[PDB]
């Protein structure tokens, strides 16, 4: 008890060298599309056509 | 800390320069050394510095080092 005055809990924890995500980066396919010039008209004061 | 060291700190604070800029690179290394040596002349020539201030500072540092090392040894025996 006498020595306990000078003490304080130290923060040390166990961990792993690497921790992986719950769900990995599932890859996605490349689907070709043409250049669509009408995809920014809902941002700001758009000018449709 | 609240005794002799405090008094020497107060005295040397009185003796220290009021303003001290860090010169620019263009001033040179020799010029900067000369400037520093001129500005801190009173501290450099203080006789009691190395024989009293440093002694008390050494005492304080030795005390804290002893606390650290004794804690390490205690842990090593506990394990």
């Amino acid at each position: 008890r006498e020595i306990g005055i000078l003490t304080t809990n130290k923060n040390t924890s166990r961990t792993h060298k690497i921790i992986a995500p719950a769900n990995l980066e599932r890859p996605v396919r490349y689907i070709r599309k043409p250049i669509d010039y009408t995809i920014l008209d809902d941002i700001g004061h758009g000018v449709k056509v | 800390l609240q005794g002799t060291i405090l008094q020497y700190v107060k005295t040397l604070m009185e003796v220290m320069p009021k303003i001290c800029r860090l010169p620019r690179h263009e001033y040179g290394s020799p010029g900067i050394l000369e400037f520093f040596h001129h500005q801190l002349k009173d501290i450099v020539e203080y006789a009691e510095l190395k024989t009293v201030c440093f002694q008390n500072l050494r005492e304080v540092g030795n005390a804290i080092l002893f606390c650290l090392l004794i804690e390490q040894s205690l842990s090593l025996e506990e394990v």
Binding site: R32, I35, D41 | -
Partner: protein, 95 residues
């Protein structure tokens, strides 16, 4: 006011960066001999590819002169593996 210069510029810049990425990957895949398409290294297609390249813009199927006989039996595969590269080049042209 109907030119939509801002939007057109914004769209085309992203498109250009994407095309650059794709074309860089095509270049890298075509550089190392162990990753280019299998048809550019086969020994029996060498004559066919040399003939095709020697007159690239023009198509001269009929009157092949047996410089394309081999290519006529892997066509279902040629047309199915080189599709990605061809359409990347097409998209470069459209951009």
């Amino acid at each position: 006011s109907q030119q939509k210069l801002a939007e057109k510029l914004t769209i085309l810049n992203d498109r250009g960066v994407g095309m650059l990425t794709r074309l860089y990957n095509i270049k890298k895949a075509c550089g190392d001999p162990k990753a280019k398409p299998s048809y550019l290294i086969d020994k029996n297609l060498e004559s066919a590819v040399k003939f095709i390249v020697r007159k690239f813009p023009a198509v001269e199927t009929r009157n092949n002169n047996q410089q394309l006989a081999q290519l006529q039996k892997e066509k279902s595969e040629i047309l199915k593996n080189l599709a990605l590269y061809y359409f990347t080049f097409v998209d470069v042209m459209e951009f």
